[PDB]
Design an enzyme around this catalytic site. Structure first.
Site, short mmCIF file in Angstrom:
data_model
loop_
_atom_site.label_atom_id
_atom_site.label_comp_id
_atom_site.label_asym_id
_atom_site.label_seq_id
_atom_site.Cartn_x
_atom_site.Cartn_y
_atom_site.Cartn_z
N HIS A 215 42.47 -16.41 -1.86
CA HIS A 215 43.03 -17.75 -1.87
C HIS A 215 44.19 -17.86 -0.88
CE1 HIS A 215 44.46 -21.56 -3.83
NE2 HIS A 215 45.61 -21.11 -3.37
N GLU A 216 45.13 -16.92 -0.94
CA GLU A 216 46.25 -16.94 -0.01
C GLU A 216 45.78 -16.74 1.42
OE1 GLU A 216 48.53 -17.83 -3.15
OE2 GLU A 216 49.11 -17.85 -1.03
N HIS A 219 44.63 -20.01 2.94
CA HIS A 219 45.78 -20.76 3.42
C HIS A 219 46.22 -20.25 4.79
CE1 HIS A 219 46.41 -23.32 0.03
NE2 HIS A 219 46.60 -22.33 -0.82
N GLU A 241 45.73 -27.42 -1.50
CA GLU A 241 45.30 -26.52 -2.57
C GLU A 241 43.87 -26.83 -2.99
OE1 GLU A 241 48.73 -24.37 -2.42
OE2 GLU A 241 47.01 -23.95 -3.72
#
Ligand SMILES: Cc1c(-c2ccc(F)cc2)n[nH]c1NC(=O)CS
Ligand SMILES: [Zn+2]
Length: 389
Positions: A215-216, A219, A241
Site C-alpha cells: 500500500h505504501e 503511494h 487513499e
C-alpha cells in the site's frame, strides 16, 4: 532461520543479506545524513535507489523530534536496541522479497526504481540540475561525504508507532508529487506490528504486513512519477487513499474527474519533454540524463532526437500506476484475507522466523493447519504469532 531464499541461491530483489552488525562501508552499508542538523544514522542499501533506515523517524519532520505522546499506539522503547533494528532490517527485507515474489510486485518495484525524480532544480530553463532534497549524504570509509540520489527510504515510525505514511520533502514553488517530476519518498513503516480486522468465514484476523507495505509502495509510485492526487480532494478520506486501495472503493472517485486527472498529467509529461528538448547544459553528460528520463516517462524520440509523449505509452504507464498497482490486486496475488474497504486492534508480530511467516505463504504456512481458511491470520487459532496490545 529466516527463509529469505526459498528458491535459488540468492535473494532476487534485495542485494545483500544484511545484519545490522555488519561493518560499515561506503556503498551499501553506510552512515548517512538527511538534508535538513542530525548526527549520522546507519543505513542499508537494499536495492538501486532504495535505502532502509532501521531507526525511529525523528528526522523527517522538525516537529516530530520527540517519541513521547502529546487509534494510536506509543512506546518510546521500540526500536532502540541493535537486536530490534536487526529484526527490523530482516523483516523489511523479507517483505520486499515477498512482494517481489508476485508478478504484480515485480512490476511495481520495477516502476519505482525507474521513477528517478526529475532534475528540475535549475532556475535557468536550459539547464538540468538535481534537487538536493532528492539525495542523501553517504559517509565513505575514509570519512568523506558523497551526495547520492535515491528514490525511496524505508524508515521506522515516529512517536505513533502505527502511523504509517508515504512522505517526501517539498519545494518552495514546485509541487514535485503533482507536476510529473517526482521526489524521493520516505515511508514510515514497521514490520513488527499489524492491525486486526473482523470477518465471519466472528473471526478476528490480522492484516498481512506485506499488503500494508505494498500500500505504501503504491503511494510512492504515484509520488515518484508526480501524478499524486491533491490531498484536499477527499470524501473524510482522500481520493489518493481510495485509488491506492483499489477494488470497488476506487469506483467512488468521480470517473470524469479522473479523466480530468489523466489529461492534467499528460500535459505535465509534455512539459517535461519540452524541458528535455530545451536543455543545452547540465550541472553535476546531458544526453545520458536525457535518456534516463526518456526511459522513466517512456518518451518517444524522432530521427531529430526530439522527445515527445506517445498517448498510448502514457495511458499504459498511467493506468499501471493508478489502476493496476492497488492494495486490492495485491490481496488477490497474495491469496490472503484482507479488509474489504479502506476503512480495530493492534498486534505485535515477528515475521522473521521462517516458522512464523514465509515469503510465499505469509502467515498461512502450507502443509499445516494454518494453510486452510486463512487460519494463519486468525489471531485466535494462530495466537502464537500475535500479541494483542
Ligand atoms: C496504512 C496505514 C496504517 C496501517 C494499516 C494496516 C496495518 F495493519 C497497520 C498499519 N497505519 N497508518 C496508515 N496510513 C494511511 O492510512 C495513509 S498511507
Ligand atoms: Zn495510504
Amino acid at each position: 532461520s529466516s527463509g529469505l531464499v526459498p528458491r535459488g541461491s540468492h535473494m532476487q530483489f534485495v542485494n545483500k543479506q544484511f545484519n545490522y552488525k555488519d561493518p560499515v562501508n561506503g556503498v551499501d552499508i553506510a552512515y548517512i545524513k538527511i538534508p535538513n542538523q542530525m548526527q549520522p544514522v546507519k543505513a542499508f542499501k537494499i536495492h538501486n535507489k532504495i535505502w532502509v533506515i532501521p531507526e525511529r523517524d525523528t528526522f523527517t519532520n522538525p516537529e516530530e523530534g520527540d517519541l513521547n505522546p502529546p487509534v494510536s499506539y506509543y512506546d518510546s522503547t521500540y526500536l532502540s536496541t541493535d537486536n530490534e533494528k536487526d529484526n527490523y532490517l530482516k523483516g523489511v527485507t523479507k517483505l520486499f522479497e515477498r512482494i517481489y515474489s508476485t508478478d504484480l510486485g515485480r512490476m511495481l518495484l520495477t516502476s519505482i526504481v525507474r521513477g528517478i525524480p526529475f532534475w528540475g532544480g535549475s532556475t535557468i530553463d536550459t539547464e538540468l540540475k538535481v534537487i538536493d532534497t532528492n539525495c542523501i549524504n553517504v559517509i565513505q570509509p575514509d570519512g568523506s561525504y558523497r551526495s547520492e540520489e535515491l528514490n525511496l527510504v524505508i524508515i521506522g515510525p515516529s512517536a505513533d508507532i502505527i502511523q504509517f505514511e508515504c512522505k517526501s520533502f517539498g519545494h518552495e514553488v514546485l509541487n514535485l508529487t503533482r507536476n510529473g517530476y517526482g521526489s524521493t519518498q520516505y515511508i514510515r513503516f514497521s514490520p513488527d506490528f499489524t492491525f486486526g480486522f473482523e470477518e465471519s468465514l466472528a473471526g478476528k484476523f490480522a492484516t498481512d504486513p506485506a499488503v500494508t507495505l505494498a500500500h505504501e509502495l503504491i503511494h510512492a509510485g504515484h509520488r515518484l512519477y508526480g501524478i499524486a492526487i491533491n490531498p484536499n480532494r477527499v470524501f473524510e478520506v482522500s481520493f489518493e487513499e481510495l485509488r491506492t486501495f483499489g477494488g470497488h472503493d476506487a469506483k467512488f472517485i468521480d470517473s470524469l474527474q479522473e479523466n480530468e486527472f489523466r489529461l492534467y498529467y499528460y500535459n505535465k509529461f509534455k512539459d517535461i519533454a519540452s524541458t528535455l528538448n530545451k536543455a543545452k547544459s547540465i550541472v553535476g553528460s546531458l544526453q545520458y540524463m536525457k535518456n534516463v528520463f526518456k526511459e522513466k516517462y517512456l518518451l518517444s524520440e524522432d530521427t531529430s532526437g526530439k522527445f515527445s509523449v506517445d498517448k498510448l505509452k502514457f495511458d499504459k504507464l498511467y493506468k499501471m500506476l493508478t489502476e493496476i498497482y492497488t492494495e486490492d490486486n495485491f490481496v488477490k496475488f497474495f491469496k490472503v484475507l484482507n479488509r474489504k474497504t479502506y476503512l480495530k486492534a493492534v498486534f505485535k508480530i515477528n515475521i522473521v522466523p521462517k516458522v512464523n511467516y514465509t515469503i510465499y505463504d505469509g502467515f498461512n504456512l502450507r502443509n499445516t493447519n494454518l494453510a486452510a481458511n486463512f487460519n494463519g491470520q486468525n489471531t485466535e487459532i494462530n495466537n502464537m504469532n500475535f500479541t494483542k496490545l
